[PDB]
């Protein structure tokens, strides 16, 4: 699940991206700081096209950043030119290395694509070590695309709240302790409270990563999963805010050899929304 900087730029040099191979910027940031789109025009890996997650998302939900139709996710790829066949790789550039990138590997996998990576390091490292960048725009080929929702890999509403008296999974949190906690409010919105889902155990997705942006290593893994209790070879769902750094602990998982942590996409956003007040508690003392 992890390409190096290294393999990237050789593949890129050798001509290789194009059908076999695709390469994804998946960058989103909150209003107000960097624009996403507008950097990617400027500057992206030769070849690289841009994975919008405003647009290949269930527009019509109340909830954020939602999965789309398996129909939607699939013109929408499809157009940028990646079929069943294809190998894909999602990088985005935020400053700690990979913030959206997992949540784009993980939507290609719930809608049954095995083959994608995330370039281990992302932009930020791609630009550091100085390998090519262009602002020509990348055009290819339409392909078709086939998605097959993967159940498995995906948890609902209801099925977090069934799993509330049965403990069949365990939940882990990826957001920060203080929001987790209750002790510091949800960015991005009005009278939502932090505070967290009764039962989950909180893994920040920031320590999944080392100050340079690269992912740590399976071992160092491992050795995070052990400290929280997290027992790899029993269920496991992962939640945050709204299913985007939760993903991080799919692919940490990943990477310790366990394939199928599902993501509640929902995450605390539906949660706060939809759930009995009850199921949840907070520091702050609501």
């Known amino acids: 699940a992890l390409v190096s900087t290294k393999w990237l730029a050789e593949s890129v040099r050798a001509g ?34 841009f994975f919008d997650i405003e647009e290949c998302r269930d527009k019509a939900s109340p909830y954020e950043v939602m999965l789309p139709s398996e129909a939607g996710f699939a013109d929408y790829v499809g157009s940028l030119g990646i079929s069943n066949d294809t190998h894909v790789v999602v990088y985005d550039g935020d400053d700690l290395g990979s913030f959206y990138a997992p949540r784009v590997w993980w939507m290609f ?22 390998h090519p960048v262009t602002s020509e725009p990348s055009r ?72 340079d942006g690269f992912e740590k290593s399976p071992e160092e893994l491992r050795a995070m999963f052990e400290a929280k209790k997290v027992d790899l070879t029993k269920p496991l769902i992962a939640t945050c805010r709204k299913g985007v750094t939760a993903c991080h602990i799919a692919l940490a998982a990943y990477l310790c050899g366990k394939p199928d942590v599902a993501i509640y996409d929902g995450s605390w956003f539906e949660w706060f929304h939809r759930a009995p007040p009850e199921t949840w508690v907070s520091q702050g003392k609501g």
């Open 16 to 49: 290789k991206v194009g059908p076999g191979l695709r390469v994804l910027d998946a960058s989103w940031y909150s209003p107000g700081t960097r624009e996403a789109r507008k950097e990617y025009l400027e500057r992206h890996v030769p070849g690289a096209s």
């Open 140 to 211: 290819p080929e339409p392909a078709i695309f086939k998605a097959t929702l993967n159940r498995s890999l995906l948890k609902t509403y209801e099925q977090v709240l069934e799993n509330l008296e049965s403990k069949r999974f365990q939940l882990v949190d990826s957001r920060a302790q203080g929001r987790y906690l209750g002790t510091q409010p949800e960015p991005d919105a009005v009278g939502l409270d932090s505070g967290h889902i009764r039962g989950s155990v909180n893994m920040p997705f920031m320590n999944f990563l080392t100050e």
């Open 109 to 130: 996998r719930v809608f049954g694509h095995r083959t994608v990576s995330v370039l281990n390091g992302g932009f930020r490292n791609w630009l550091k070590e100085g």
